[PDB]
């Protein structure tokens, strides 16, 4: 399972990249606007992420119509070979995805909330589909169940679109994604750093530390 970081915070990205466990980054206009303050510009934030991240970097189009989406996508593509054009699950967005896939431009279909939307994105040739588990949790539906169904549907038809679990809120979203077999998770930095941690790991290290000071004082 690949692990992407779901942020536009450059320090978070650099920190997690340095850890070696970050395979890519996903951004969206809301994540970018949180960082484009006090003089920082949306165009520089995107360019810096692309430079620091060896892996896929998803960048969301802001046009809502087919022609504007395809124009933006080609410019986003031109920013670097690792850029992935993020496009929402809409009729115009499915049209844009089909055109871009035929142009060999990698795409990521976002704002997916049920398995049939994910299937429609895959039928257009999308490289990634991003169902939003946490927003389903927010409205009283276990969001991971949709990941499970998408995984079964994709396996039934040998679909090559990668399942990118998005809107992740806690480490159990991550665990269930891995057990289900989703291709990718994208996580906030606070979730990312918790994944390495466990109280019995800490207790174990102090235990070995005290044992090491018995045979080697220094």
Which residues have a catalytic role annotated? Answer: 86
Interface with its own copies includes 51 (CB under 8 A)?
A: no
Q: 104 vs 139, which CB is nearer to its own copies?
A: 139
Kindly identify the residues of this chain, within the stretch 2-41, that bind its own copies according to CB under 8 A: 3, 18-21, 28-30, 32-33, 36, 41
Task: Tell me the CA distances in angstroms from 214 to 22, 39, 65, one per residue in order.
Answer: 38, 56, 70
**Residues contacting residue 153 through CB under 8 Å, at least 6 positions apart:** 115, 118, 119, 159
Q: In the stretch 168-197, what mask flags binding to its own copies with x, by CB under 8 A?
A: -xxxx-xxx-xxxx------------xxxx
Q: In the stretch 130-169, what mask flags binding to its own copies with x, by CB under 8 A?
A: --x-xxxxxxxxxx-----x--xx--xx-----------x
Select from 38, 39, 91, 217 the one that contacts its own copies (CB under 8 A).
91
Q: In the stretch 52-71, what mask flags binding to its own copies with x, by CB under 8 A?
A: --------xxxxx-------
The helix (H) or strand (E) run that includes residue 117 is: helix 115-123
Interface with its own copies includes 44 (CB under 8 A)?
A: no
CB of 192 to its own copies, least distance (A): 10
φ, ψ of residue 95 in degrees (nearest 5): -60, -50
**Chain centroid to CA 33:** 18
Select from 49, 120, 126, 147 the one that contacts its own copies (CB under 8 A).
120
Comparing CA positions, the residue from 51, 33, 25 lying closest to residue 186 is: 25
Q: How many residues does the chain have?
A: 218
CB of 64 to its own copies, least distance (A): 7
Q: Say what angle helices 144-156 and 171-180 make with each other, to 10 degrees.
A: 20
Select from 5, 87, 94, 163 the one that contacts its own copies (CB under 8 A).
94
Determine contact, residues 100/72, Cβ cutoff 8 Å.
no
Interface with its own copies includes 104 (CB under 8 A)?
A: no
CB of 86 to its own copies, least distance (A): 10
Q: CA angle, corner 114, sides to 29 and 193, nearest 5?
A: 55
Interface with its own copies includes 217 (CB under 8 A)?
A: no
Select from 10, 42, 48, 82 the one that contacts its own copies (CB under 8 A).
42
CB of 180 to its own copies, least distance (A): 8
**Residues contacting residue 168 through CB under 8 Å, at least 6 positions apart:** 6, 133, 134, 174, 177, 185, 186, 187, 188, 191
For 137, the 3-state DSSP assignment is: helix
């Amino acid at each position: 399972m690949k692990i992407f970081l779901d942020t536009a915070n450059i320090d978070e990205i650099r920190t997690g990249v340095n850890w070696g466990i970050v395979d890519g980054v996903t951004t969206n206009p809301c994540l970018i606007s949180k960082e484009a303050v006090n003089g920082k510009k949306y165009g520089d934030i995107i360019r810096e992420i692309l430079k620091i991240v060896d892996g896929p970097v998803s960048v969301e189009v802001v046009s809502t119509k087919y022609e504007g989406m395809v124009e933006e996508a080609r410019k986003i593509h031109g920013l670097g070979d690792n850029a992935v054009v993020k496009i929402p699950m809409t009729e115009d967005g499915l049209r844009a995805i089909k055109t871009l896939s035929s142009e060999h431009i990698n795409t990521n279909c976002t704002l997916v909330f049920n398995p049939i939307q994910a299937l429609l994105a895959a039928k257009a040739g999308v490289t990634y589909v991003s169902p939003f588990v946490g927003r389903l949790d927010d409205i009283g539906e276990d969001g991971m169940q949709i990941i499970d169904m998408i995984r079964t549907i994709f396996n039934n038809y040998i679909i090559k679109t990668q399942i990118l679990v998005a809107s992740i809120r806690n480490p159990i979203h991550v665990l269930r994604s891995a057990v289900i077999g989703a291709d990718v998770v994208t996580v906030p930095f606070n979730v990312l750093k918790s994944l390495m941690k466990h109280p019995k790991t800490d207790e174990g290290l102090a235990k070995f530390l005290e044992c090491w000071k018995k045979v080697s004082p220094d």
